[PDB]
Symmetry: D3
Subunit: 237 residues, 6 copies
């Protein structure tokens, strides 16, 4: 009998800090290239998860799939069953902000959404999906120590990758949303429920307004910046 | 350059009919054990997809991940880029209906949801996520020919696997929803948008109100029934 | 001492199968021209209802008035007090679909709406108003036996006949809604509540986008086809 | 070709003031017992309408059927096509107010609702369905002149006669709603749109909280009071 | 220990009738120029309140600040703690109605809003913020005795003075809202809760569509008219 | 002609950094006891505002009234007309969190709300009212330098001081909201619109759940601690 319907890991197999990204093959890339002593601890549904050490400190990395419902399953389980204390989401994003550019690293303070999941948690009201301040601060300070500039601010998590919605990008730009992605607004309230911590850091692959797009080489540079910031932050958490 | 951001398959690598299930490893099980001549055509993000034949007719099977946002990405791409004509979702479900029991096969005619994705398509109004009548009929007729009883009726697709919502199950039972799952309400409107076809068939693993639960052996038997119905239906579609 | 506040019929005065249309004078025309041994069983509020036989089987026909609140009153009473098992709504509709034309016969699988009644039944969520599959199938098979082509698919039930809403028609057309009327979305959830069956069949009088319109002579012919399909379907139910 | 799809009357056949009630047979009773020089001007769908004189002044009376969608059709047509200036709704109601009793006459100043029709008119915001002040005033003074006490205050128009909603009656009572009915909230905004006038007066048939119910004799007394108030008010309008 | 968190007055220091305006300095001007024996009874938060007599009858005047939340605090306290029976709001307003002009006096019968406060009182439904009919009638009659023409009809209370909302003014004009301000819709339901009375009268300082605006001398003239109407109305209440 | 309808200050009369609190008399106390060379720059509506220096750096202090609509007027004007760059709200709050106590200092990262103002800015979606990270960090370190412990996390801004809402406090506690107040959720999106910065710090006067309450002497100690944290923070901003 598995510890959860979606994870074959035993309790204790996950470290107290987990980095998560949507693509399980990127979780494997992170484990292979940045973790020592790495072991695979889950392969249910292909959602690869790993546990090793980064500069001596135990750390896990696991895929979360695409969209709020998917990350909600995995994060709820990590906090509840596996007793994880901190999850940092790592990924790519689009941007609409006029002063944010392709290749920028975005540290998320809070995330809006077009999902109903947070209204359902707070009697239909506005519940800001808010990153933990110690996690945000650790990402900011790590980036500074690594000499990597960052953008710090709001994300927007959508349920629909293939948006047909007119006027959305313009409103997001007006209020200086810096990242558009699909998961962070589902993660932060789950961390709240469990008295635990979460954050998110993303790299800008596309400017939704100007249509600038990162080259493969720029995506490599940005990814290497982002993952080093996240990894060094875990030593602080 | 991949044909889509989430699929490395070339146009033409997918048959005009695709079976989809949330777990890519179950897609592989279907391809290996029920399709002949199965070839893997996608492994991006571990979301395995295959193309082979059932009784000589080309058929594909691919994972769709968990939740409406995930299936929406994959289905939008299959209809738009790969020119798929028919998607049949296959899976397990819970039930709340007093006349539905563990091991029952459920053929979905329409699906409700707590997602916002369909309100956003229809100016905020009620948009029923409705299965295609030829697909539903093909599934019903296939089951009749295979001597397998079916329940035919409404599903409910939730964004939240780990529900904390009081009164929901009782209202679903009152109106005889037969299946609770997480994806069909996102699939059916995308098929509409592309002038294409979709349906869903599921087997009951759990009764959410009585707490009865299928054993692993029962889940295997149910799966075998369901998949035979779906495969035979594809010959009619 | 009436059995309901809106119906003087005694329990037993209605057959288990009832055809309903908005106009009570059309219910009388159906009863006079297609039922044998028809007896008037209600005239409260002018909402004429009749009971006789069609080809030997008991059948009733009654008006339901205009709009969801009106049909809700009459259908709730028919299922609850009069122990009706099957209601088939018959009527005319508009269409927005590019491939549906005036004079087409539409068999409804599910209906969207701008009403709040179904959100109120399902804790504010999306509750698809869904026709019973056996009823839909009986109507489809009846039309086939009569060599009458049909369109099968979604309707949209509006509270506002004199719409002023910009963009609605275009969105309905985009998702291939085939019929626009005012009642079916209220009928189907009431059938669900009582564990009973309902369906709807309509003929297109107007194309809302192209502005084509049926002549009076064409409306009479369409009506005759539609009512024959429904009557023959009742024999299979 | 009829002047509207629901009314065979010619332009000019309706007086500038129209009394309306849900039951067309009650419209006929009002015409038969209170109008002189009465002629029937509509019988489409059985929705009887009449035009005569009350104490020398032309006055019409017509049924409107049950529910907001039904009255919306007939009232929109009366103001737009028939150039009516004033509609007064007359009917029965329930009450929840602790200081209102069965047999009381209620003059409606504004009406709440669970319908979406008024949100759709005002960009989703709160649009109070508000009676015209001159009409309200004419009803109040007419009652004073006739020595009939009245209750003056808010109504609530519901789409669901067979309510299953918990806590509604208690909230309506807390805010001293005096009448529960099904149509007035749909009438007043249409009058607004046409720069015209509307009101509503109702007699209490039932106390929804205490379950007191008017006897047939009490219903006769209250009806005679209400209709005399309405008729006398028309002379001032 | 103060009688409320926002008011230093002792129980009884307020008359049973209170005029309120947004600007506490204007409340002081009203007390100084129109009340006899006026004494200041509150200065908490600068929200000046006063109690005196007008033509022998006890009357109070107090500021309520800007917006629904502010007036909700002060009015709730006045009705609950200070046992006030009647509150009349006096102020300035904009208009969008084509037949309303700068300097007009508007007597409010009911008020719409973009606030959520009334939906939260009535289980999410439409709750009309409705003025007490005796107050409306007293204001109308007072104006007539003073030979001052008045406009009588709906207001709209917004939370956002600096509106950026497209299409709102056009919709308000189409349904003949005569006044735009920020507080009345919050006042009237609180009066209902306590079984008390409220009304609102304002003078048009700006036409939002034509951009016409009152001169300072005209604003003084209209204010004197409006305040005299309110004062005389208090003698009838 | 005033620079704005609610403020008599000339352009330039406000420093680029402004502390704001609800009570204008508390604004006056802050200016008198903590600013040097303070001059009053506004008295419209009694909403006192002042400008001086703190430790040599220009600084203003002004009241904002009670509730989101009030602070929206003043903050919009300060950012737009007066070209303010940073607003820090200072005040008192309640708490429901089990780990937060009376006298605690709360630094707000983001604020939820039952207001509609932010949905109206983002096409009906969830828009998190989010404090600027540099401001939050300036407040946290200022407290660290002063050896004052702080709580950092979410606030909830309500429109209704006199809440009657069942289950709200329990949900706020479950998700570890640390502060309940009435304004911050309105401030943060306005700062966003103008490309500027805002934050909020409050001291807990009351525990809503335990009913523990600050003595007047304790409120004074906490207020001084909070205000010194804000003042020192302005020197880093």
């Amino acid at each position: 009998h598995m510890a959860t319907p979606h994870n074959s890991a035993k309790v204790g197999d996950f470290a107290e800090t987990v980095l998560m990204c949507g693509d399980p093959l990127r979780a494997k890339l992170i484990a292979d290239n940045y973790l020592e002593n790495a072991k695979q601890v889950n392969s249910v549904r292909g959602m690869l998860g790993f546990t090793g050490t980064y500069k001596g400190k135990p750390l896990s990395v696991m895929g979360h799939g695409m969209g709020i419902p998917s990350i909600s399953i995995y994060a709820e389980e990590l906090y509840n069953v596996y007793k994880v204390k901190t999850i940092i989401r790592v990924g790519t994003c689009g941007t609409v902000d006029p002063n944010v550019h392709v290749r920028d690293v975005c540290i998320v303070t809070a995330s809006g959404t077009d999902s109903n999941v947070n209204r359902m948690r707070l009697l239909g009201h506005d519940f800001p999906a808010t990153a933990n301040f110690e996690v945000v601060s650790a990402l900011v300070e790590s980036a500074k120590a690594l000499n990597i500039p960052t953008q710090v601010g709001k994300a927007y998590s959508t349920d629909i990758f293939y948006s047909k919605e007119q006027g959305l990008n313009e409103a997001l730009a007006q209020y200086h949303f810096i990242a558009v992605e699909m998961e962070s607004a589902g993660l932060f309230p789950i961390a709240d429920y469990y008295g635990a911590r979460a954050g998110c850091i993303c790299t800008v692959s596309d400017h939704i307004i100007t249509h600038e797009s990162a080259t493969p080489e720029e995506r490599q540079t940005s990814f290497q910046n982002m993952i080093k910031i996240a990894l060094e932050a875990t030593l602080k958490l």
